[PDB]
Each structure stands twice: as structure tokens, then as C-alpha cells.
Design a binder for these strands. Structure first.
Ligand SMILES: [Zn+2]
Ligand SMILES: [Zn+2]
Ligand SMILES: [Zn+2]
Length: 85
DNA sequence: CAAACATGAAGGGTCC
DNA sequence: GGGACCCTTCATGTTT
């Protein structure tokens, strides 16, 4: 009822955080909308994709600031950036 | 064959 | 709303 909490429409559990209901709903539906650009593994949250990318940034340190895609060469990252703008 | 242990994935808290 | 990191539980694998 408070602005800090939401009720899940599927399971009626209370969830904390104004924007944090969608990440809970995806745990029901299985939606994994974040994909590692290197190994294509998918994740339910940007949260855990960012941590997963640590596996790759040792060899691919050039990171997109919009989506976190990792690249071995800066000219690869620059070509990626065309996709955003 | 079970119990302990390591590791990490999953999910929800919590604070900018 | 988003990013970021924390905290706890639990699943899986490995060691003892
Ligand atoms: Zn729910
Ligand atoms: Zn990956
Ligand atoms: Zn990008």
C-alpha cells in the first residue's frame, strides 16, 4: 500500500522498491531479456548480466556504456555504437 | 553411500 | 524508473 512496496499480481507477494516489480514478474514468466553479446547466455536482470560480463572483460575490456557489450578492440566497440544512435 | 564443504545461481532487500 | 551491490537461501558439484 505504501509507495515503497508493490503487490505481485500473480502471487500476491509484497515486493520492495518502486521500480522492482518487473524483475519479480520475470521470475514467474521466465523472461530473460538481457543477453551476453559474447556467449549469448540470457539473464532475467541487468544486475546479473553485469556480473557475468566480468568473465569476459579480461580479454574484452572495451565496454559499451549503453548496454554493456564487451569487445576486444576499440574499433569493434565503435562499430557497435552505431547500433545505438 | 552420506555428510561437509565450495561455488555460484536465484531472488528479494536496500541505497543512491 | 534505473544502476549497483548486499544478504540469504538453495541447487549443484566436489571433497572427505
Ligand atoms: Zn509473484
Ligand atoms: Zn557471456
Ligand atoms: Zn551497446
Amino acid at each position: 500500500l505504501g509507495s515503497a512496496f508493490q503487490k505481485c499480481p500473480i502471487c500476491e507477494k509484497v515486493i520492495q522498491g518502486a521500480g522492482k516489480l518487473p524483475r519479480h514478474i520475470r521470475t514467474h514468466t521466465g523472461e530473460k531479456p538481457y543477453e551476453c553479446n559474447i556467449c549469448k547466455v540470457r539473464f532475467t536482470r541487468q544486475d546479473k548480466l553485469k556480473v557475468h560480463m566480468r568473465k569476459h572483460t579480461g580479454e574484452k575490456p572495451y565496454l559499451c556504456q549503453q548496454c554493456g557489450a564487451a569487445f576486444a578492440h576499440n574499433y569493434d566497440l565503435k562499430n557497435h555504437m552505431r547500433v545505438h544512435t
